[PDB]
Structures are given as structure tokens and as C-alpha cells.
Design a protein around this ligand. Structure first.
Ligand code: HEM
Ligand SMILES: [Cl-]
Ligand SMILES: [Zn+2]
Ligand SMILES: [Zn+2]
Length: 123
């Protein structure tokens, strides 16, 4: 195997096998890195300015890069596995026009990640 690379994943509605409304805001694929004996994923979101916070498996995002022009950011999370489901949280805050009409949105959600990374890279 390889201790770094890309991995496919999907974001599911919490504790279901259904695609989350959140899923479109997550760029695919992510990357993974194994370092200091631990496993990490590096996930890029779009509409970054709408997503005020993220955590996975109880760990808050560590923002490693931002692209202000594309309204994207890349966040690193420690994970217990590269293949399988891990619950996470996302905070969303929107206050701007949608189709010309003011829209406001302020929610904190649970989500379930399904990671489809390699099975031969252990912690
Ligand atoms: C204009 C933008 C958006 C609209 C109109 C919208 C609308 C909705 C609606 C109607 C629900 C169902 C709530 C319920 O029935 O209780 C929902 C749930 C949800 N939304 Fe939002 N949403 C928007 C943006 C976002 C964004 C940017 C994210 C995250 C990046 C997000 C993440 C979620 C999550 C995680 C749920 C819970 C159910 C699921 O996982 O699909 N939404 N949204
Ligand atoms: Cl979490
Ligand atoms: Zn809030
Ligand atoms: Zn809410």
C-alpha cells in the first residue's frame, strides 16, 4: 500500500445510507495521509464561507489551506480508519440573496461520512 494518496467518499444523512444535502458541498476525491502513526483525511469543501465549522469523530477541523477565489477550503481531520463510516458534524450559516431574495440559514447538523479509501493502510 501507500501511506498517502486520494480517496473517494460520500456524505450521508446521519445514520442512513442516503446521500446528504451536504454532499454536493464536499469536493471529491479527498486525500489521506498516514503520519506519526496516525491516519488523516484532507477534505476540500466548496461554498466554504457558508460552512462555519466541521468536526469528524469528535475532532474539529484543522484548516490547512484556503482558496478565497473559488470559495473553497481544505481541512485535515484525524480519523480511526480510511475505509468505513464515521459520524461528524457541520455548522452552516448563510445570509445572502438566493434568486434575488434574501435567504437566512443557521444550523448545526450531524452527518455520516462513508470513506472508501485503501484497506491496507493501518494506524
Ligand atoms: C440554499 C441552501 C440550502 C437549502 C435551501 C437547504 C435546505 C434544507 C432542507 C429543506 C433540509 C431538510 C430539513 C428538515 O426537513 O428537517 C436540509 C437539511 C440538511 N442540510 Fe440544508 N440547505 C441548504 C444548504 C446547506 C448546506 C450548505 C449544507 C452543508 C454544507 C447543508 C446541510 C444539510 C444537512 C447536513 C441536512 C440534514 C439532512 C441531510 O443530511 O441531508 N444544507 N437542508
Ligand atoms: Cl464530530
Ligand atoms: Zn447557529
Ligand atoms: Zn438546526
Amino acid at each position: 500500500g501507500s501511506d498517502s494518496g486520494t480517496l473517494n467518499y460520500e456524505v450521508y444523512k446521519y445514520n442512513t445510507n442516503d446521500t446528504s444535502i451536504a454532499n454536493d458541498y464536499f469536493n471529491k476525491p479527498a486525500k489521506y495521509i498516514k503520519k506519526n502513526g496516525k491516519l488523516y483525511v484532507q477534505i476540500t469543501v466548496n461554498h466554504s464561507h457558508w460552512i462555519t465549522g466541521m468536526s469528524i469523530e469528535g475532532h474539529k477541523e484543522n484548516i490547512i489551506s484556503k482558496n478565497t477565489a473559488k470559495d473553497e477550503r481544505t481541512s485535515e481531520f484525524e480519523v480511526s480508519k480510511l475505509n468505513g463510516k464515521i459520524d461528524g458534524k457541520i455548522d452552516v450559516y448563510i445570509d445572502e440573496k438566493v434568486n434575488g431574495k434574501p435567504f437566512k440559514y443557521d444550523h448545526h447538523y450531524n452527518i455520516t461520512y462513508k470513506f472508501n479509501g485503501p484497506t491496507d493502510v493501518a494506524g
